């Protein structure tokens, strides 16, 4: 009976994910063996930081990572739903039903569910990319993660998305929004109300020079130099040495006139910013102070990729060749104090629209600072789901989707004759874990809210056309309430691309576990 104990091993980790989805969710502190503490609310990220013993657990972990890579949202919906399909299948094992027909029953029920998703679409997203229109998609993403920040972070995330998107409509051929266009930075001090939206990358380091910021001139030229600043010598070896004191005056003054000659030609071309990926010498910073050139050092090669897509600069393998064709152009750059420390940021005005933006976060809490950093990344992939593959269609969330499917699946159960009726009935009951989890973790009584959810989607109407309100979902309460409330008041919806993709992944996840009747292991 190891197939029964295999579900119990997942059941131990099932209750861990039941405390994740919903507003009651909380991050888990994990101390790595290297002395580094990683804290995140996302359950998919935690799976990489946990040591897996039983190999059957990795099956659900691999399916969970698929939800984060493609759609980026719904990782908690895949793991929780896949864990419940094993519990409803455990009763069929004790009943005597073979696991072969159980797998065949899910394949027939999956095709019936996908055909009903097109009829459950309420609204359609016009892809206007307006600041007020993006508030409906971003609100449920921030919801059920961090409480109280949903109102403040709604305007910060929606504003940064509209900056990187150009003006276009009804065109899906050329992609625009990427996953790297939104970067999250953190700084000690401040609050969430004082946070602003930047149209470009934000640098929290020091300029390392006497020039704090450039002027207001239009189209500042920015050059990226991968070669370090130093006198040109032989690429092979070429170490500067002093044999006698006579050559000291020639070598010292030789490097001063050589560097100044290269900086003079760059300043004549109109380049007010020099990006040096490598170290900068001592004599190089002295000449850049009089010419008024901002000093910037970016040793990380990952940040230079998003910089070339904004101003248009190109990295030069050599030094002293300011080719005007490969130079970048930025409208305005300024150095201001944000969060208590003076830093040099990167923004724009009108032309040279940036394809990458960065949101500055401020707060007095260290634990909640890294939690919002991981929460915004989940909202970045939500914009990617607005493309042609069912980006405009949406379904009502807050547990209203799983409850509404109960009436439609049970209607097709008696319609299909044969032994498949056992798997179809258990397939709809497995959706009851979503409303029960939100009601149990919120302190609400099961004998109260749960029977009201069944009566919300099932009523007696003297007519063929549906009426009254089908939008009533699961309410978290927390203060007081009578019955349930309409979800359309808070405008909490779920995209079709996220819900439809989570069904096929969760179906194949539980299919693999039920299909394995034997597991062979060996000690290392």
């Amino acid at each position: 009976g190891q197939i029964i104990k295999s579900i119990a091993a997942i059941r131990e980790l099932h209750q861990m994910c039941l405390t994740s989805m919903g507003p009651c969710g909380r991050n888990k502190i994990i101390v790595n063996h290297l002395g580094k503490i990683i804290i995140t609310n996302d359950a998919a990220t935690m799976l990489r930081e946990l040591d897996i013993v039983h190999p059957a657990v990795k099956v659900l972990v691999m399916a969970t990572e698929q939800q984060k890579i493609d759609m980026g949202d719904g990782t908690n919906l895949v793991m929780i739903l896949a864990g419940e399909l094993l519990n409803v299948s455990e009763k069929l094992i004790s009943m005597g039903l073979s696991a072969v027909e159980i797998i065949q029953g899910y394949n027939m029920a999956r095709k019936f569910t996908l055909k009903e998703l097109d009829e459950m679409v309420v609204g359609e997203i016009t892809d206007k990319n307006d600041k007020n229109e993006l508030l409906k998609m971003i609100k449920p993403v921030i919801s059920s993660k961090k409480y109280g920040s949903e109102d403040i972070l709604s305007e910060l995330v929606s504003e940064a998305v509209s900056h990187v998107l150009p003006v276009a409509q009804q065109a899906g051929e050329i992609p625009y929004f990427n996953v790297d266009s939104i970067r999250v930075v953190k700084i000690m001090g401040g609050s969430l109300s004082n946070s602003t939206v930047i149209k470009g990358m934000v640098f929290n380091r020091e300029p390392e020079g006497h020039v704090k910021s450039l002027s207001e001139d239009k189209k500042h030229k920015v050059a990226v130099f991968t070669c370090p600043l130093d006198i040109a010598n032989t690429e092979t070896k070429g170490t500067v040495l002093l044999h006698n004191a006579q050559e000291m005056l020639d070598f010292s003054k030789g490097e001063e006139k050589q560097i100044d000659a290269m900086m003079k030609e760059i300043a004549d071309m109109g380049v007010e910013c020099i990006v040096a990926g490598a170290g900068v010498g001592e004599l190089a910073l002295h000449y850049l102070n009089r010419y008024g050139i901002l000093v910037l050092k970016v040793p990380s090669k990952f940040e230079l990729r998003r910089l070339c897509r904004v101003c248009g600069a190109t990295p030069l393998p050599r030094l002293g060749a300011p080719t005007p064709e490969e130079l970048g152009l930025v409208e305005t750059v300024k150095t201001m104090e944000i969060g208590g420390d003076r830093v040099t940021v990167f923004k724009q005005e009108q032309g040279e629209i940036s394809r990458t933006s960065t949101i500055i976060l401020r707060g007095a809490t260290q634990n909640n600072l890294d939690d919002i950093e991981r929460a915004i990344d989940d909202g970045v992939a939500a914009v990617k789901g607005l493309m042609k593959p069912s980006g405009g269609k949406l379904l009502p969330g807050a547990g209203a989707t799983e409850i509404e499917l109960i009436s439609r699946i049970t209607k097709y159960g008696e319609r299909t004759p044969g032994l498949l009726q056992l798997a179809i009935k258990q397939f709809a009951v497995a959706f009851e874990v979503v409303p029960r989890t939100l009601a149990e973790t919120a302190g609400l009584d099961v004998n109260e809210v749960l029977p009201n959810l069944y009566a919300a989607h099932n009523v007696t109407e003297p007519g063929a056309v549906k009426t009254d309100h089908l939008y009533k979902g699961v309410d978290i309460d927390g203060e007081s309430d009578e019955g349930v409330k309409d979800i359309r008041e808070e405008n909490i919806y779920d995209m079709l691309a996220t819900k439809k993709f989570a069904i096929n992944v969760a179906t194949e996840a539980a299919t693999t576990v039920l299909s394995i009747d034997q597991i062979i292991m060996a000690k290392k």
């Binding site: 040109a232 690429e235 050599r318 060749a321």
Partner: protein, 49 residues
């Protein structure tokens, strides 16, 4: 490496690297004009391992 100290020395030092490149490149671009130049809806692909 080839490091030039003046604009005139840029094409002189780099001429050794582009000597073999320009020899083959100028002969390939002439094939597109002589052959398959007028024919619409066609293309020319180079493998270049």
């Amino acid at each position: 490496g080839f490091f030039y100290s003046s604009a005139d020395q840029r094409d002189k030092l780099a001429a050794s690297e582009r000597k073999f490149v320009d020899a083959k490149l100028k002969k390939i671009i002439d094939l597109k004009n002589e052959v398959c130049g007028m024919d619409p809806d066609k293309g020319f692909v180079i493998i270049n391992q």
